[PDB]
Symmetry: C2
Subunit: 93 residues, 2 copies
Amino acid sequence: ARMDWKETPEAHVFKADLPGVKKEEVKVEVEDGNVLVVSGERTKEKEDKNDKWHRVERSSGKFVRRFRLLEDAKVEEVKAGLENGVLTVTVPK
Amino acid sequence: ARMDWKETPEAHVFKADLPGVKKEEVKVEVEDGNVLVVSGERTKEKEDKNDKWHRVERSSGKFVRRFRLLEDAKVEEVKAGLENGVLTVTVPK
């Protein structure tokens, strides 16, 4: 989960490369008022059991990440969207 | 760009993690008659100086991937799909 953290004047924007991940496999939470938490685990591709694996580089697993926000976030204002393999978490300041 | 290479009884299937890449930035071709070429660019969101970066782990720029297909592969029947940051190329046998 390679991630970026940008602070525009309007909000804190986090990006996470989570290719091939479904929302039911990712989790965005807030702890102790100012700690953004991103975790998950890409599911096994329920693809043809018996296939021959010539080469496998894409090998993702479980993970958890945390960031200390500069200010307590208004959890009901935090937006999180998943698109084209990129998770985006916007935190309004 | 991380890629998997699996083989089904019907075709060789290639997967590529391309988070944050729109189908207009990816190119799928067959060079020299039997070389699969997956390339494109993961555009950097330069933005404005008003912004402030606290963390940067995600990569950007050009990517190039080449696999040598069989001298007898349905080169005219290769399909390419892009969904949830994952590219899939199906080369019929």
